[PDB]
Design a protein around this ligand. Structure first.
Ligand SMILES: CCOc1nc(C)c2nc(-c3cncc(F)c3)n(Cc3ccc(CN4C[C@@H]5C[C@H]4CN5C)cc3)c2n1
Ligand SMILES: CCOc1nc(C)c2nc(-c3cncc(F)c3)n(Cc3ccc(CN4C[C@@H]5C[C@H]4CN5C)cc3)c2n1
Lengths: 763, 763
């Protein structure tokens, strides 16, 4: 099979057309760059680790490197897991990167470097220096980066990682980086925008700084700029869960009217959390092509009423206007201006946090003609009165989000080291609807999904509540109180395809009342039924029935009492679900499967899930009754023994998952003749030795994956074939270097199974 | 000390004036009535157990018995813990009670008896037969009870314990029990009221039966009747979490107008859950003195608007009218009749579940002159708009309960086997108040308590919100989101004495923002501060200060980080609370107390609580710094060793609590010279042997209590003095017969320490 046992503890990828060889040691706790790295590599990854420093010998022989990823090898005080200390920062020797003529990108984020490393090659196009302790930028240290294109100098001075002085940037330190395109100076205690900036900028991220004023000659040359993030300078700090220093006298970021003049190619402009009170239309005079405009967390609740500046944004695609309420004001209505009708190309419109009382009909009348409008977000407004029949006018929409309301009948780019596919959606999750009348959902026939999760509705549905929802294809009814007393529940939902009644545990917990679990017979096109976490322990109906159900999730219920000893009533509880192909009876406290349930399983079953149950002994010779099973999932159980011969058990099994089980050693003919299998998982067990007789490469040659890590191989010389095969076969076994370790004997504890070579075995 | 080692495994009580001797074997798993019971006993208790049967030899010699309690020795199928089976029911021999000439009361509940036991003495005045399988009553088996006074025949046929036939009662089976006073026929599948009943009845409990009609000659002779419970016959069954069978055609219990005619001494009348739609004033024509009237769970929402029948109840004290809503009706207002003003003596008025929308001013105008009215319950109504200033008219009240609303800016006698003390209360718990304005609480100066728990208010209080609450003495602010950024929070609450800001964990969890924990300095009369479960891990303020605080509950926070290693900042966090006398720093993840915190404790501290922390080693020689401690509480910790000499440690300790600790044996001079101690608790430990040298009776003679059960005494002959003292001293040691057992050696496993006599020790 192989004569090249490669002990390199990091993965390798080969895309010979891309001419790329990617060797990634991510989260591998190495104390040094290993030897034997191929000279063929292009991308190298050395993130969270314990590497002490760099040296010219680090990348000595590697000329074909285009990418080095050295992120966060000594995390700052508050920015990383403080179970892993470095004794001090990283140190980079002189001429530590010059020998990399083909280098193009380099990530040194989170490494407590105090100044920018020098000697980098001129071919470098990217450079990430975030979460470091560089709080001073001078021209002479940027002399070497005259060809750079991406420069991430963020998170160098802020509350998670402080430096106690404002960012200093000397005059025109960035000017002669003529190829510079992206510059992210976020979270750097910067006090002024660093003029003069290169004219070839396309993205400038100055957000979360202490910039209080903008000068008129500040964005004066950037005419190829497309993104401008000025978010969080002079923030809105009330009730902020993070340390934030507002401006003086509660002032908004002072931007002159003629500041966005030279910006003509501007496409994104984020002014989130600027304590803004007005937004002049003169800002948007020259920016013709603005697409996205963030204006959250300001004091614009009075501007949203006027909002003159929207007549200048005819190409606007997004408009975030969330969280602009005035403290201690609970408005009776939303006051959107008539200037919202000039947003011809608008698609998304989030106005959460406008806190107000009643959503009436004609308050959204400006939006009655935005033909491209799709999302209409109105969560977290504490609305109380809202006639849902007023959305017979927003039919062409795609989401009508009305979550956390009360209706009744910092750094989101911090790279630390559903219903919508079905059509129109009405999200009424987490409102205060305590019962369902059919007349409420009148005029909402077009609805293809309805989320009612979290309303805590206590109701015995008798098949009349959702009558006008004629086209409904998805219904989320989780986290409610459903009384399944009638089998005619959900009967008028004729086109329904998904039904979620999970976490409706209240009445299913009760003992003695009826639970008509055959309510699915009348649902002709239902494809998926989620009813997990319902504590279903009893059922008046002896069977479930549906000629179309294909998925059933039944996890977090009580099937041990339904399948109690001597109780043959609910043995064929699923047998009549004919098209069913994926059962998820997991976390059902099942301590043993009563012999006979497998004869009462649907015929076309394909993907079974028995995870986290408590299975003390799951018989296998009954698998033959499932002549279509492919994805048996028994992870996180308490089995002890494996089948005698997986050939004799199932003739179609291909996805066994015995993760986190209690197995101590497999059989002598385990995978004997069982060719059809294509995936297996014995991770996190107590298995000790695995011989050859049960693992013929006749079978192994086709296994796409196989996991045996975190278990208890005692790696003595009883396992010579184990050694030779595990470090000389090409069966994929992930983490073959770090987590599948050896328990013994003694001096060979903590050994790798790939680092195994017992020479004195046949001496 | 003693020469009478009494091995009786049940407690004894002696009230020589009452001439009572009470021996109670409650929950003692005895398989037979033990021998040696004193002939002096009066009351005997033999509840939940495994007694097989009775016999004339059971109470052979006991003539002075007045009470036998034989409850639930074989619980029904669903009515008891099904970890304890009887093989079959109890059996009572003939003449099993006749020899008890002085017997007066006998409780045979839950014993699966099929008919009433015969031969009982004529002196019997009480008889409890609930949860049995007697579903037939005949006169000849009641011939013997001609002097009984209390007869509890309840729970003999219902859903928890069925019998599959209606209760049969032959004609006049009860008539010639001339002394009968209380008769409870509840939960018996009774179909008709059992005429003819003895004329000396004062309490008739017929509730939770299948009685559909009342006849006019049914309560025809009972003129000394005072309580009449007809609740749950023809129930209101919608969304009922228990199996209930409604009547036919959804009819109310059919009571004729002239049915409560002979009832003249009626004082309580419960008609809860009768599906009633009208309540005629002719029912209440003759019952002049009705005090309490239950009418919950009916269909009276239209009668509450008319409620003519209230003109006939001028002595009514209580009126429950809860849960009378009509399904799928959300009323705009509450419609109380003007006939609520005729309830001159009314005190309590619960109208929960009237589900309606807005509580306006003049809707409670009938109640504006009920001078004795104290409680006014309006929870669970889903009210949305309610000006709290309209309660400047209900000042004379005592509770104004407005919980689970949405305001913004079966068998409750099933005997199975706060703010109000402070004055006026406004309960606004679990409403939808998301911020506090001072103008909301205007006109509520009279309020002596305010519950705002569960409103999830996110607010930075700067000392102006509760301005009109001038007299407030209690404030519950638990389960909210409090931002302790200012020390002037709660500053205008001048008379405040209790403050609950527990479970306000949101902003205290955040790291980096200020937490002014010295906000208590400005609170001059504050006596108690509860701030548990706040996850307080940091504090901008180095101390807490109050010249009046006497209780402080600080449990479920993070003091391990406040008292971190080398961090001497928050060592004196409490030292300035001068009058403090009870600290509750428990469940604070404290793994060790940094030496020096005891020097920073308040001087007058009296009752300290370090339970469920994680203490690995709690030093004792530092207790001397607390020269007023009396109630050290170290339960549920992980200590190992006890102090060398509790005399040298504290000179005022009297309530040590080391429950559930990890102790393996005390010292040789543990309580040496430590006379002042009066209570001790070493239950649930791993202690093995306790010698005499450390336990002198010079000290033991005064100990009011001492607990050492559920620990690991290996009861070999190394402990001769342990044996003699533990079964020959009169130091109280509870459960000295059942749970303080012996681990060895071998044949002496599971032994009692009172059943210990190793004769061959000094042979
Ligand atoms: C004196 C106080 O007067 C007052 N007045 C009015 C009208 C309020 N409305 C709310 C409210 C509550 N929850 C959701 C809401 F949208 C609003 N609060 C409380 C509040 C205020 C600010 C933040 C700050 N958060 C960080 C942000 C922005 C916001 C949510 N994002 C995470 C959280 C909570 C209000 N407080
Ligand atoms: C087609 C349904 O139409 C409808 N119409 C209206 C106006 C309702 N109001 C509520 C409601 C919800 N929660 C609290 C409430 F006071 C009312 N429900 C739901 C409901 C109804 C009955 C019960 C039965 N419970 C046993 C009892 C009595 C009640 C509480 N006690 C434990 C629980 C829940 C409503 N359902």
């Amino acid at each position: 099979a192989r004569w090249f046992p490669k002990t390199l503890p990091c993965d390798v990828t080969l895309d010979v057309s891309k001419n790329h060889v990617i060797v990634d040691c991510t989260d591998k706790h190495l104390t040094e760059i290993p030897g034997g790295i191929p000279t063929n590599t292009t991308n190298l990854t050395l993130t969270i680790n314990h590497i002490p420093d760099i040296s010219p010998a680090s990348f000595h022989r590697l000329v074909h490197l285009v990418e080095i990823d050295f992120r966060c090898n000594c995390v700052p005080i508050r920015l990383g897991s403080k179970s892993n200390m470095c004794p001090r920062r990283l140190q980079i020797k002189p001429r530590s990167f010059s020998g990399l003529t083909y280098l193009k990108s380099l990530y040194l984020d989170g490494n407590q470097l105090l100044e920018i490393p020098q000697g980098l090659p001129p071919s470098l196009q990217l450079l990430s220096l975030e979460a470091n302790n560089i709080f001073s930028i001078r021209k002479e240290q940027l002399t070497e980066l005259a060809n750079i294109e991406i420069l991430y100098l963020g998170q160098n001075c802020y509350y998670r990682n402080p430096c106690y002085v404002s960012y200093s940037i000397e005059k025109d330190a960035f000017l002669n980086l003529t190829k510079l395109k992206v510059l992210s100076l976020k979270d750097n205690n910067v006090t002024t925008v660093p003029t003069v900036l290169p004219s070839t900028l396309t993205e400038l991220y100055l957000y979360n700084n202490m910039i209080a004023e903008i000068q008129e000659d500040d964005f004066n040359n950037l005419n190829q700029l497309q993104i401008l993030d000025l978010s969080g300078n002079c923030p809105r700090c009330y009730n902020a869960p993070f340390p934030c220093t507002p401006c003086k006298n509660n002032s908004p970021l002072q931007i002159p009217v003629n500041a966005f003049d030279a910006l003509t190619e501007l496409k994104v402009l984020r002014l989130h959390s600027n304590s803004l009170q007005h937004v002049p239309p003169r800002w948007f005079k020259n920016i013709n092509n603005l697409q996205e405009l963030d204006l959250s967390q300001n004091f614009l609740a009075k501007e949203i009423g006027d909002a003159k500046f929207l007549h200048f944004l005819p190409n606007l695609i997004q408009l975030d206007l969330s969280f602009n309420f005035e403290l201690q004001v609970y408005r009776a209505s939303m006051n959107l201006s008539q200037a919202f009708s000039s947003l011809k190309s608008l698609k998304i419109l989030r106005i959460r946090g406008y806190v107000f009382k009643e959503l009436k009909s004609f308050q959204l009348s400006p939006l009655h003609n935005l033909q491209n409008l799709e999302v209409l977000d109105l969560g977290t407004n504490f609305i109380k009165i809202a006639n849902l029949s007023m959305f017979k006018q927003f039919k062409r929409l795609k989401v009508i989000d009305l979550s956390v309301n009360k209706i009744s009948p910092y750094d989101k780019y911090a790279r630390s080291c559903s219903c919508y596919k079905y059509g129109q959606t009405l999200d009424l999750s987490k409102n205060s609807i305590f019962f369902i009348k059919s007349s409420d959902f009148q005029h909402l026939s077009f609805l293809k999904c309805l989320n009612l999760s979290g309303n805590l509705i206590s109701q015995t549905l008798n098949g009349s509540e959702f009558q006008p929802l004629a086209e409904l294809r998805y219904l989320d009814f989780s986290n409610n109180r459903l009384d399944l007393l009638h089998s005619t529940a959900f009967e008028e939902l004729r086109k329904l395809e998904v039904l979620d009644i999970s976490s409706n545990s209240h009445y299913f917990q009760s003992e003695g009342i009826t639970h008509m679990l055959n309510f699915t017979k009348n649902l002709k096109v239902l494809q998926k039924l989620m009813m997990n976490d319902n504590d279903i322990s009893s059922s008046t109906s002896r069977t479930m029935e549906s000629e179309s159900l294909r998925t059933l999730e039944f996890r977090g219920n009580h099937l041990d009492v339904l399948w109690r000893d001597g109780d043959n009533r609910y043995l064929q509880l699923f047998k009549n679900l004919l098209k069913l192909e994926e059962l998820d009876i997991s976390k059902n406290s099942l301590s043993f499967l009563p012999s006979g349930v497998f004869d009462g399983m649907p015929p076309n079953l394909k993907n079974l899930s028995l995870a986290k149950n408590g299975l003390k002994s799951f018989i296998w010779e009954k698998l033959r009754y499932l002549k279509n099973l492919e994805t048996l999932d028994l992870s996180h159980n308490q089995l002890t023994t494996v089948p005698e011969r997986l050939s004799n058990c199932s003739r179609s099994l291909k996805n066994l998952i015995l993760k986190n089980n209690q197995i101590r050693s497999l059989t002598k003919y385990f995978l004997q003749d069982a060719f059809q299998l294509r995936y297996l998982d014995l991770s996190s067990n107590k298995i000790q030795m695995i011989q050859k007789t049960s693992f013929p490469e006749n079978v192994l040659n086709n296994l796409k994956m196989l996991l045996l890590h975190h278990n208890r191989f005692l790696c003595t010389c009883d396992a010579v074939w184990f050694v030779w095969w595990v470090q000389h076969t090409e069966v994929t076994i992930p983490y073959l270097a770090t987590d599948v370790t050896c328990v013994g004997p003694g001096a060979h504890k903590g050994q790798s199974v790939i680092s195994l070579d017992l020479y004195t075995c046949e001496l």
